[PDB]
Ligand binder design. Structure first.
Ligand SMILES: O=C(O)CCCC[C@@H]1SC[C@@H]2NC(=O)N[C@@H]21
Ligand SMILES: O=C(O)CCCC[C@@H]1SC[C@@H]2NC(=O)N[C@@H]21
Ligand SMILES: O=C(O)CCCC[C@@H]1SC[C@@H]2NC(=O)N[C@@H]21
Ligand SMILES: O=C(O)CCCC[C@@H]1SC[C@@H]2NC(=O)N[C@@H]21
Lengths: 120, 120, 120, 120
Protein backbone atom coordinates (compact mmCIF):
# COMPACT_ATOMS: atom_id res chain seq x y z
CA UNK A 1 0.00 0.00 0.00
CA UNK A 2 1.32 3.47 -1.13
CA UNK A 3 1.00 5.93 1.84
CA UNK A 4 1.98 9.58 1.27
CA UNK A 5 3.85 9.62 4.61
CA UNK A 6 7.55 10.49 4.16
CA UNK A 7 9.74 12.90 2.21
CA UNK A 8 9.43 13.39 -1.55
CA UNK A 9 11.13 15.48 -4.23
CA UNK A 10 9.69 16.54 -7.56
CA UNK A 11 11.00 17.24 -11.04
CA UNK A 12 11.50 20.96 -10.21
CA UNK A 13 13.54 20.07 -7.11
CA UNK A 14 10.83 20.96 -4.58
CA UNK A 15 10.65 18.91 -1.39
CA UNK A 16 7.62 17.94 0.63
CA UNK A 17 7.33 16.07 3.88
CA UNK A 18 4.09 14.34 4.77
CA UNK A 19 3.26 13.14 8.28
CA UNK A 20 1.06 10.23 9.39
CA UNK A 21 -2.03 9.45 7.35
CA UNK A 22 -5.01 8.95 9.67
CA UNK A 23 -7.80 6.36 9.28
CA UNK A 24 -9.84 8.86 7.20
CA UNK A 25 -6.88 9.35 4.86
CA UNK A 26 -6.14 12.87 6.10
CA UNK A 27 -2.56 14.12 6.30
CA UNK A 28 -0.58 17.22 7.02
CA UNK A 29 2.91 18.18 6.03
CA UNK A 30 5.23 20.86 4.74
CA UNK A 31 6.26 21.95 1.27
CA UNK A 32 9.52 23.69 0.30
CA UNK A 33 9.10 24.91 -3.26
CA UNK A 34 12.22 25.28 -5.39
CA UNK A 35 10.53 27.98 -7.52
CA UNK A 36 8.13 30.88 -6.99
CA UNK A 37 7.05 34.16 -8.52
CA UNK A 38 9.46 35.78 -6.02
CA UNK A 39 11.92 33.08 -5.01
CA UNK A 40 13.75 35.43 -2.60
CA UNK A 41 10.64 35.22 -0.43
CA UNK A 42 10.25 31.41 -0.29
CA UNK A 43 9.61 29.92 3.14
CA UNK A 44 8.51 26.46 4.24
CA UNK A 45 4.73 26.23 3.88
CA UNK A 46 2.05 23.94 5.32
CA UNK A 47 -0.06 21.45 3.41
CA UNK A 48 -3.25 19.56 4.28
CA UNK A 49 -4.86 16.80 2.24
CA UNK A 50 -6.71 13.52 1.94
CA UNK A 51 -5.80 10.23 0.29
CA UNK A 52 -7.87 7.13 -0.22
CA UNK A 53 -7.18 4.41 2.34
CA UNK A 54 -8.22 1.00 1.00
CA UNK A 55 -6.55 1.33 -2.39
CA UNK A 56 -2.96 0.16 -2.81
CA UNK A 57 -2.47 2.88 -5.44
CA UNK A 58 -4.61 5.66 -3.95
CA UNK A 59 -5.68 8.91 -5.49
CA UNK A 60 -5.21 11.97 -3.24
CA UNK A 61 -5.35 15.74 -3.08
CA UNK A 62 -3.74 18.42 -0.96
CA UNK A 63 -3.67 22.18 -0.51
CA UNK A 64 -0.51 24.21 0.08
CA UNK A 65 -1.04 27.51 1.89
CA UNK A 66 2.02 29.49 0.83
CA UNK A 67 3.38 31.33 3.88
CA UNK A 68 5.10 34.01 1.79
CA UNK A 69 2.42 35.02 -0.72
CA UNK A 70 -1.35 35.39 -0.99
CA UNK A 71 -1.51 32.43 -3.39
CA UNK A 72 -2.67 28.85 -2.84
CA UNK A 73 -1.84 25.67 -4.77
CA UNK A 74 -3.80 22.44 -4.92
CA UNK A 75 -2.32 19.17 -6.13
CA UNK A 76 -4.13 15.97 -7.06
CA UNK A 77 -2.78 12.69 -8.31
CA UNK A 78 -2.15 9.02 -7.72
CA UNK A 79 0.57 6.99 -6.01
CA UNK A 80 1.79 4.17 -8.22
CA UNK A 81 3.86 1.18 -7.10
CA UNK A 82 6.20 -0.41 -9.70
CA UNK A 83 6.81 -4.14 -10.15
CA UNK A 84 10.01 -3.45 -8.11
CA UNK A 85 8.11 -1.68 -5.33
CA UNK A 86 9.23 1.83 -6.30
CA UNK A 87 6.68 4.59 -5.71
CA UNK A 88 5.92 7.59 -7.90
CA UNK A 89 3.36 10.33 -7.37
CA UNK A 90 1.92 11.59 -10.65
CA UNK A 91 0.22 14.94 -10.02
CA UNK A 92 -1.30 17.95 -11.54
CA UNK A 93 -1.81 21.27 -9.87
CA UNK A 94 -3.69 24.55 -9.93
CA UNK A 95 -1.93 27.66 -8.55
CA UNK A 96 -4.41 30.38 -7.57
CA UNK A 97 -3.17 33.95 -7.31
CA UNK A 98 -4.96 36.69 -5.44
CA UNK A 99 -6.44 39.36 -7.69
CA UNK A 100 -7.92 42.72 -6.73
CA UNK A 101 -11.51 42.07 -7.72
CA UNK A 102 -13.72 39.70 -9.62
CA UNK A 103 -13.09 41.43 -12.97
CA UNK A 104 -9.51 40.01 -12.88
CA UNK A 105 -10.57 36.46 -11.99
CA UNK A 106 -9.93 35.18 -15.52
CA UNK A 107 -6.14 35.54 -15.12
CA UNK A 108 -5.79 34.07 -11.63
CA UNK A 109 -5.19 30.33 -12.20
CA UNK A 110 -2.05 28.60 -13.48
CA UNK A 111 -1.90 24.87 -14.21
CA UNK A 112 0.91 22.33 -14.40
CA UNK A 113 2.26 18.90 -13.51
CA UNK A 114 4.71 17.39 -11.09
CA UNK A 115 6.22 13.94 -10.71
CA UNK A 116 7.44 13.04 -7.22
CA UNK A 117 9.74 10.28 -6.00
CA UNK A 118 10.88 9.44 -2.49
CA UNK A 119 13.86 11.22 -1.09
CA UNK A 120 15.38 8.05 0.40
CA UNK B 1 -14.27 40.36 4.64
CA UNK B 2 -15.33 37.32 2.58
CA UNK B 3 -15.96 34.27 4.79
CA UNK B 4 -15.95 30.57 3.72
CA UNK B 5 -17.71 29.12 6.79
CA UNK B 6 -21.34 28.38 5.91
CA UNK B 7 -23.51 26.72 3.24
CA UNK B 8 -22.88 27.14 -0.48
CA UNK B 9 -24.32 26.03 -3.80
CA UNK B 10 -22.65 25.99 -7.20
CA UNK B 11 -23.72 26.37 -10.81
CA UNK B 12 -24.17 22.58 -11.19
CA UNK B 13 -26.51 22.41 -8.19
CA UNK B 14 -23.96 20.85 -5.83
CA UNK B 15 -23.95 22.04 -2.23
CA UNK B 16 -21.34 22.14 0.49
CA UNK B 17 -21.14 23.13 4.11
CA UNK B 18 -17.91 24.48 5.56
CA UNK B 19 -17.32 24.57 9.30
CA UNK B 20 -15.38 27.12 11.41
CA UNK B 21 -12.06 28.28 9.97
CA UNK B 22 -9.27 28.03 12.54
CA UNK B 23 -6.39 30.46 13.18
CA UNK B 24 -4.27 28.71 10.54
CA UNK B 25 -7.05 29.03 7.97
CA UNK B 26 -7.87 25.29 8.08
CA UNK B 27 -11.42 24.03 7.59
CA UNK B 28 -13.47 20.88 7.21
CA UNK B 29 -16.85 20.34 5.66
CA UNK B 30 -19.19 18.11 3.69
CA UNK B 31 -19.83 18.11 -0.07
CA UNK B 32 -22.93 16.86 -1.91
CA UNK B 33 -22.26 16.72 -5.62
CA UNK B 34 -25.26 16.99 -7.93
CA UNK B 35 -23.36 15.09 -10.68
CA UNK B 36 -20.97 12.14 -10.88
CA UNK B 37 -19.63 9.43 -13.17
CA UNK B 38 -22.19 7.14 -11.48
CA UNK B 39 -24.78 9.47 -9.95
CA UNK B 40 -26.85 6.64 -8.45
CA UNK B 41 -23.87 6.06 -6.13
CA UNK B 42 -23.54 9.62 -4.77
CA UNK B 43 -23.01 9.91 -1.02
CA UNK B 44 -21.93 12.82 1.17
CA UNK B 45 -18.17 13.31 1.03
CA UNK B 46 -15.77 15.10 3.37
CA UNK B 47 -13.65 18.07 2.42
CA UNK B 48 -10.52 19.50 4.05
CA UNK B 49 -8.76 22.72 3.09
CA UNK B 50 -6.92 25.91 3.92
CA UNK B 51 -7.70 29.57 3.25
CA UNK B 52 -5.65 32.67 3.81
CA UNK B 53 -6.63 34.43 7.02
CA UNK B 54 -5.59 38.11 6.73
CA UNK B 55 -6.90 38.86 3.24
CA UNK B 56 -10.41 40.29 2.91
CA UNK B 57 -10.87 38.32 -0.35
CA UNK B 58 -8.82 35.22 0.44
CA UNK B 59 -7.55 32.54 -1.87
CA UNK B 60 -8.12 28.98 -0.67
CA UNK B 61 -7.98 25.34 -1.64
CA UNK B 62 -9.70 22.16 -0.52
CA UNK B 63 -9.74 18.45 -1.26
CA UNK B 64 -12.90 16.35 -1.53
CA UNK B 65 -12.41 12.66 -0.81
CA UNK B 66 -15.32 11.10 -2.66
CA UNK B 67 -16.92 8.48 -0.40
CA UNK B 68 -18.46 6.56 -3.30
CA UNK B 69 -15.63 6.28 -5.83
CA UNK B 70 -11.85 6.01 -5.98
CA UNK B 71 -11.59 9.56 -7.31
CA UNK B 72 -10.50 12.79 -5.61
CA UNK B 73 -11.22 16.43 -6.50
CA UNK B 74 -9.30 19.53 -5.54
CA UNK B 75 -10.80 23.02 -5.77
CA UNK B 76 -8.93 26.32 -5.57
CA UNK B 77 -10.23 29.84 -5.90
CA UNK B 78 -10.90 33.18 -4.31
CA UNK B 79 -13.78 34.55 -2.24
CA UNK B 80 -14.98 37.89 -3.63
CA UNK B 81 -17.37 40.39 -1.99
CA UNK B 82 -19.21 42.97 -4.12
CA UNK B 83 -20.50 46.46 -3.17
CA UNK B 84 -23.62 45.05 -1.44
CA UNK B 85 -21.81 42.38 0.61
CA UNK B 86 -22.71 39.50 -1.72
CA UNK B 87 -20.07 36.76 -1.76
CA UNK B 88 -19.03 34.51 -4.62
CA UNK B 89 -16.42 31.77 -4.68
CA UNK B 90 -14.75 31.68 -8.09
CA UNK B 91 -13.10 28.26 -8.38
CA UNK B 92 -11.32 25.87 -10.67
CA UNK B 93 -11.00 22.16 -10.01
CA UNK B 94 -9.07 19.05 -10.95
CA UNK B 95 -10.87 15.67 -10.71
CA UNK B 96 -8.43 12.76 -10.47
CA UNK B 97 -9.61 9.28 -11.39
CA UNK B 98 -7.91 6.06 -10.37
CA UNK B 99 -6.16 4.27 -13.21
CA UNK B 100 -4.54 0.87 -13.21
CA UNK B 101 -0.92 1.80 -13.73
CA UNK B 102 1.29 4.68 -14.68
CA UNK B 103 0.89 4.04 -18.44
CA UNK B 104 -2.73 5.26 -18.13
CA UNK B 105 -1.86 8.38 -16.14
CA UNK B 106 -2.31 10.68 -19.14
CA UNK B 107 -6.11 10.20 -19.10
CA UNK B 108 -6.71 10.51 -15.35
CA UNK B 109 -7.33 14.25 -14.78
CA UNK B 110 -10.41 16.28 -15.65
CA UNK B 111 -10.58 20.06 -15.23
CA UNK B 112 -13.39 22.57 -14.83
CA UNK B 113 -14.82 25.56 -13.03
CA UNK B 114 -17.45 26.25 -10.43
CA UNK B 115 -19.00 29.46 -9.15
CA UNK B 116 -20.46 29.16 -5.64
CA UNK B 117 -22.94 31.44 -3.93
CA UNK B 118 -24.20 31.40 -0.34
CA UNK B 119 -27.36 29.43 0.42
CA UNK B 120 -29.58 31.97 2.21
CA UNK C 1 -27.12 21.25 -36.05
CA UNK C 2 -24.93 23.66 -34.05
CA UNK C 3 -22.86 25.91 -36.34
CA UNK C 4 -19.64 27.82 -35.45
CA UNK C 5 -19.60 30.22 -38.42
CA UNK C 6 -20.81 33.65 -37.28
CA UNK C 7 -20.31 36.24 -34.52
CA UNK C 8 -20.02 35.31 -30.84
CA UNK C 9 -19.57 36.96 -27.47
CA UNK C 10 -18.37 35.41 -24.23
CA UNK C 11 -18.95 35.94 -20.53
CA UNK C 12 -15.95 38.32 -20.29
CA UNK C 13 -17.28 40.53 -23.09
CA UNK C 14 -14.82 39.31 -25.72
CA UNK C 15 -16.13 38.84 -29.25
CA UNK C 16 -15.07 36.70 -32.18
CA UNK C 17 -16.11 36.18 -35.75
CA UNK C 18 -15.68 32.80 -37.40
CA UNK C 19 -15.75 32.42 -41.17
CA UNK C 20 -17.07 29.53 -43.31
CA UNK C 21 -16.18 26.04 -42.10
CA UNK C 22 -14.72 23.92 -44.91
CA UNK C 23 -15.31 20.23 -45.67
CA UNK C 24 -12.49 19.24 -43.31
CA UNK C 25 -14.01 21.30 -40.50
CA UNK C 26 -11.28 23.99 -40.71
CA UNK C 27 -12.04 27.64 -39.99
CA UNK C 28 -10.43 31.03 -39.59
CA UNK C 29 -11.62 34.11 -37.79
CA UNK C 30 -10.80 37.17 -35.73
CA UNK C 31 -10.82 37.54 -31.94
CA UNK C 32 -11.24 40.74 -29.90
CA UNK C 33 -10.45 40.07 -26.27
CA UNK C 34 -12.06 42.36 -23.70
CA UNK C 35 -9.23 41.63 -21.22
CA UNK C 36 -5.45 41.17 -21.36
CA UNK C 37 -2.26 41.37 -19.32
CA UNK C 38 -1.82 44.83 -20.88
CA UNK C 39 -5.27 45.86 -22.08
CA UNK C 40 -4.10 49.18 -23.54
CA UNK C 41 -2.24 47.07 -26.13
CA UNK C 42 -5.19 44.97 -27.33
CA UNK C 43 -5.47 44.54 -31.10
CA UNK C 44 -7.55 42.18 -33.23
CA UNK C 45 -5.97 38.74 -33.39
CA UNK C 46 -6.42 35.86 -35.84
CA UNK C 47 -7.74 32.45 -34.94
CA UNK C 48 -7.44 29.12 -36.75
CA UNK C 49 -9.16 25.87 -35.79
CA UNK C 50 -10.95 22.66 -36.63
CA UNK C 51 -14.41 21.35 -35.73
CA UNK C 52 -16.00 17.99 -36.31
CA UNK C 53 -18.28 18.03 -39.33
CA UNK C 54 -20.82 15.19 -38.97
CA UNK C 55 -21.85 15.74 -35.34
CA UNK C 56 -24.88 17.94 -34.65
CA UNK C 57 -23.18 19.21 -31.46
CA UNK C 58 -19.54 19.16 -32.57
CA UNK C 59 -16.41 19.40 -30.50
CA UNK C 60 -13.80 21.83 -31.81
CA UNK C 61 -10.57 23.60 -31.04
CA UNK C 62 -8.88 26.79 -32.15
CA UNK C 63 -5.69 28.76 -31.59
CA UNK C 64 -5.55 32.54 -31.15
CA UNK C 65 -2.24 34.13 -32.08
CA UNK C 66 -2.29 37.33 -30.06
CA UNK C 67 -1.11 40.18 -32.30
CA UNK C 68 -0.05 42.36 -29.37
CA UNK C 69 1.89 40.00 -27.11
CA UNK C 70 4.12 36.94 -27.29
CA UNK C 71 1.37 34.76 -25.82
CA UNK C 72 -0.94 32.21 -27.45
CA UNK C 73 -4.32 30.85 -26.33
CA UNK C 74 -6.02 27.62 -27.31
CA UNK C 75 -9.74 27.03 -26.79
CA UNK C 76 -11.57 23.70 -26.99
CA UNK C 77 -15.20 22.92 -26.39
CA UNK C 78 -18.51 21.79 -27.76
CA UNK C 79 -21.36 23.60 -29.52
CA UNK C 80 -24.70 22.77 -27.87
CA UNK C 81 -28.21 23.53 -29.18
CA UNK C 82 -31.19 23.63 -26.79
CA UNK C 83 -34.90 22.91 -27.47
CA UNK C 84 -35.49 26.38 -28.99
CA UNK C 85 -32.45 26.37 -31.31
CA UNK C 86 -30.29 28.54 -29.05
CA UNK C 87 -26.58 27.76 -29.36
CA UNK C 88 -23.89 27.95 -26.70
CA UNK C 89 -20.19 27.19 -26.99
CA UNK C 90 -18.94 25.66 -23.75
CA UNK C 91 -15.17 26.07 -23.76
CA UNK C 92 -12.01 25.72 -21.73
CA UNK C 93 -8.76 27.46 -22.59
CA UNK C 94 -5.03 27.43 -21.96
CA UNK C 95 -3.14 30.76 -22.21
CA UNK C 96 0.59 30.25 -22.79
CA UNK C 97 2.99 33.05 -21.94
CA UNK C 98 6.52 33.37 -23.25
CA UNK C 99 9.20 32.71 -20.65
CA UNK C 100 12.93 33.14 -20.94
CA UNK C 101 14.09 29.56 -20.69
CA UNK C 102 12.89 26.12 -19.79
CA UNK C 103 13.54 26.62 -16.05
CA UNK C 104 10.58 29.05 -16.00
CA UNK C 105 8.23 26.75 -17.91
CA UNK C 106 6.29 25.77 -14.77
CA UNK C 107 4.70 29.25 -14.51
CA UNK C 108 3.81 29.76 -18.19
CA UNK C 109 0.27 28.32 -18.53
CA UNK C 110 -3.00 29.81 -17.30
CA UNK C 111 -6.32 27.97 -17.53
CA UNK C 112 -9.96 29.03 -17.57
CA UNK C 113 -13.39 28.74 -19.11
CA UNK C 114 -15.58 30.72 -21.44
CA UNK C 115 -19.22 30.39 -22.43
CA UNK C 116 -20.03 31.95 -25.82
CA UNK C 117 -23.41 32.91 -27.21
CA UNK C 118 -24.34 34.17 -30.68
CA UNK C 119 -24.40 37.93 -31.26
CA UNK C 120 -27.87 38.54 -32.73
CA UNK D 1 14.94 30.38 -34.52
CA UNK D 2 12.79 27.36 -33.34
CA UNK D 3 10.29 26.47 -36.16
CA UNK D 4 7.77 23.68 -35.51
CA UNK D 5 8.43 22.23 -38.98
CA UNK D 6 9.68 18.62 -38.81
CA UNK D 7 8.96 15.39 -36.94
CA UNK D 8 8.70 15.22 -33.14
CA UNK D 9 8.05 12.54 -30.53
CA UNK D 10 6.68 13.05 -27.03
CA UNK D 11 7.07 11.40 -23.65
CA UNK D 12 4.11 9.04 -24.35
CA UNK D 13 5.68 7.93 -27.64
CA UNK D 14 3.28 9.87 -29.89
CA UNK D 15 4.66 11.27 -33.15
CA UNK D 16 3.71 14.44 -34.95
CA UNK D 17 4.87 15.83 -38.25
CA UNK D 18 4.56 19.53 -38.94
CA UNK D 19 4.83 21.02 -42.42
CA UNK D 20 6.05 24.49 -43.48
CA UNK D 21 5.25 27.42 -41.22
CA UNK D 22 3.92 30.32 -43.30
CA UNK D 23 4.67 34.04 -42.80
CA UNK D 24 1.65 34.34 -40.44
CA UNK D 25 3.00 31.46 -38.33
CA UNK D 26 0.30 29.03 -39.48
CA UNK D 27 1.11 25.34 -39.92
CA UNK D 28 -0.53 22.05 -40.65
CA UNK D 29 0.58 18.54 -39.92
CA UNK D 30 -0.36 15.10 -38.70
CA UNK D 31 -0.45 13.49 -35.29
CA UNK D 32 -0.12 9.76 -34.51
CA UNK D 33 -1.07 9.30 -30.88
CA UNK D 34 0.43 6.36 -29.00
CA UNK D 35 -2.57 6.26 -26.61
CA UNK D 36 -6.33 6.77 -26.80
CA UNK D 37 -9.54 5.88 -25.04
CA UNK D 38 -9.85 3.10 -27.65
CA UNK D 39 -6.36 2.49 -28.99
CA UNK D 40 -7.59 -0.18 -31.43
CA UNK D 41 -9.23 2.66 -33.34
CA UNK D 42 -6.23 5.01 -33.63
CA UNK D 43 -5.59 6.51 -37.05
CA UNK D 44 -3.33 9.32 -38.22
CA UNK D 45 -5.09 12.63 -37.55
CA UNK D 46 -4.69 16.19 -38.87
CA UNK D 47 -3.53 19.21 -36.91
CA UNK D 48 -3.68 22.95 -37.59
CA UNK D 49 -2.02 25.68 -35.55
CA UNK D 50 -0.20 28.97 -35.25
CA UNK D 51 3.21 29.87 -33.84
CA UNK D 52 4.78 33.24 -33.31
CA UNK D 53 7.23 34.22 -36.04
CA UNK D 54 9.68 36.84 -34.77
CA UNK D 55 10.57 35.10 -31.53
CA UNK D 56 13.48 32.67 -31.47
CA UNK D 57 11.66 30.68 -28.76
CA UNK D 58 8.05 31.09 -29.93
CA UNK D 59 4.87 30.20 -28.16
CA UNK D 60 2.34 28.28 -30.29
CA UNK D 61 -0.94 26.41 -30.26
CA UNK D 62 -2.53 23.72 -32.39
CA UNK D 63 -5.71 21.68 -32.67
CA UNK D 64 -5.82 17.96 -33.43
CA UNK D 65 -9.05 16.75 -35.03
CA UNK D 66 -9.03 13.05 -34.14
CA UNK D 67 -10.12 11.07 -37.20
CA UNK D 68 -11.31 8.09 -35.14
CA UNK D 69 -13.37 9.70 -32.37
CA UNK D 70 -15.63 12.69 -31.76
CA UNK D 71 -13.01 14.29 -29.50
CA UNK D 72 -10.64 17.19 -30.11
CA UNK D 73 -7.35 18.08 -28.42
CA UNK D 74 -5.63 21.45 -28.25
CA UNK D 75 -1.98 21.88 -27.33
CA UNK D 76 -0.15 25.06 -26.40
CA UNK D 77 3.44 25.60 -25.42
CA UNK D 78 6.82 27.05 -26.23
CA UNK D 79 9.83 25.90 -28.26
CA UNK D 80 13.04 26.27 -26.29
CA UNK D 81 16.57 26.15 -27.72
CA UNK D 82 19.37 24.90 -25.40
CA UNK D 83 22.87 26.34 -25.18
CA UNK D 84 23.81 23.36 -27.45
CA UNK D 85 21.07 24.15 -29.97
CA UNK D 86 18.78 21.30 -28.94
CA UNK D 87 15.05 22.03 -29.18
CA UNK D 88 12.30 20.97 -26.80
CA UNK D 89 8.59 21.71 -26.98
CA UNK D 90 7.03 22.10 -23.54
CA UNK D 91 3.26 21.79 -23.86
CA UNK D 92 0.03 21.41 -22.08
CA UNK D 93 -3.18 20.16 -23.55
CA UNK D 94 -6.95 20.00 -23.17
CA UNK D 95 -8.76 16.93 -24.55
CA UNK D 96 -12.45 17.63 -25.19
CA UNK D 97 -14.84 14.70 -25.39
CA UNK D 98 -18.26 14.84 -26.98
CA UNK D 99 -21.11 14.57 -24.48
CA UNK D 100 -24.81 14.09 -25.15
CA UNK D 101 -26.07 17.42 -23.90
CA UNK D 102 -25.06 20.46 -21.93
CA UNK D 103 -25.92 18.86 -18.57
CA UNK D 104 -22.84 16.58 -19.03
CA UNK D 105 -20.47 19.41 -19.99
CA UNK D 106 -18.75 19.38 -16.59
CA UNK D 107 -17.09 16.00 -17.29
CA UNK D 108 -15.96 16.64 -20.86
CA UNK D 109 -12.43 18.10 -20.52
CA UNK D 110 -9.20 16.30 -19.59
CA UNK D 111 -5.91 18.12 -19.05
CA UNK D 112 -2.26 17.08 -19.22
CA UNK D 113 1.27 17.80 -20.38
CA UNK D 114 3.63 16.64 -23.07
CA UNK D 115 7.32 17.21 -23.73
CA UNK D 116 8.43 16.83 -27.35
CA UNK D 117 11.87 16.40 -28.88
CA UNK D 118 12.89 16.05 -32.52
CA UNK D 119 12.83 12.64 -34.07
CA UNK D 120 16.18 13.11 -35.84
O1 LIG E 1 4.88 31.62 -6.23
C1 LIG E 1 4.13 31.54 -5.09
O2 LIG E 1 3.57 32.58 -4.57
C2 LIG E 1 3.93 30.26 -4.40
C3 LIG E 1 4.83 29.14 -4.85
C4 LIG E 1 4.24 28.36 -6.03
C5 LIG E 1 5.16 27.22 -6.46
C6 LIG E 1 4.53 26.28 -7.53
S1 LIG E 1 3.20 25.26 -6.95
C7 LIG E 1 3.24 24.40 -8.53
C8 LIG E 1 4.71 24.21 -8.86
N1 LIG E 1 5.28 23.01 -8.27
C9 LIG E 1 6.21 23.32 -7.38
O3 LIG E 1 6.88 22.41 -6.69
N2 LIG E 1 6.38 24.62 -7.27
C10 LIG E 1 5.53 25.34 -8.20
O1 LIG F 1 -17.82 11.20 -10.12
C1 LIG F 1 -17.18 10.89 -8.97
O2 LIG F 1 -16.76 9.68 -8.77
C2 LIG F 1 -16.99 11.93 -7.94
C3 LIG F 1 -17.84 13.19 -8.10
C4 LIG F 1 -17.18 14.26 -8.97
C5 LIG F 1 -18.08 15.49 -9.07
C6 LIG F 1 -17.39 16.70 -9.76
S1 LIG F 1 -16.12 17.47 -8.84
C7 LIG F 1 -16.07 18.79 -10.08
C8 LIG F 1 -17.53 19.09 -10.40
N1 LIG F 1 -18.14 20.02 -9.49
C9 LIG F 1 -19.12 19.46 -8.81
O3 LIG F 1 -19.84 20.12 -7.88
N2 LIG F 1 -19.29 18.20 -9.12
C10 LIG F 1 -18.37 17.82 -10.17
O1 LIG G 1 -3.06 39.03 -22.42
C1 LIG G 1 -2.56 38.72 -23.64
O2 LIG G 1 -1.33 39.01 -23.92
C2 LIG G 1 -3.43 38.05 -24.62
C3 LIG G 1 -4.93 38.09 -24.34
C4 LIG G 1 -5.41 36.93 -23.48
C5 LIG G 1 -6.92 37.02 -23.24
C6 LIG G 1 -7.53 35.77 -22.56
S1 LIG G 1 -7.58 34.33 -23.54
C7 LIG G 1 -8.57 33.53 -22.25
C8 LIG G 1 -9.56 34.59 -21.80
N1 LIG G 1 -10.75 34.66 -22.61
C9 LIG G 1 -10.85 35.82 -23.23
O3 LIG G 1 -11.86 36.12 -24.06
N2 LIG G 1 -9.84 36.61 -22.96
C10 LIG G 1 -8.95 35.98 -22.01
O1 LIG H 1 -8.73 9.17 -27.25
C1 LIG H 1 -9.15 9.90 -28.32
O2 LIG H 1 -10.37 9.84 -28.75
C2 LIG H 1 -8.23 10.78 -29.05
C3 LIG H 1 -6.77 10.60 -28.73
C4 LIG H 1 -6.32 11.45 -27.55
C5 LIG H 1 -4.83 11.26 -27.25
C6 LIG H 1 -4.29 12.24 -26.18
S1 LIG H 1 -4.17 13.93 -26.69
C7 LIG H 1 -3.29 14.29 -25.16
C8 LIG H 1 -2.32 13.12 -24.97
N1 LIG H 1 -1.06 13.31 -25.66
C9 LIG H 1 -0.91 12.40 -26.61
O3 LIG H 1 0.16 12.34 -27.40
N2 LIG H 1 -1.93 11.57 -26.67
C10 LIG H 1 -2.90 11.86 -25.64
Amino acid sequence: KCSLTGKWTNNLGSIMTIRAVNSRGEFTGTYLTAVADNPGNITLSPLLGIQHKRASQPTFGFTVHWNFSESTTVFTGQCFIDRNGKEVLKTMWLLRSSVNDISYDWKATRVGYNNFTRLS
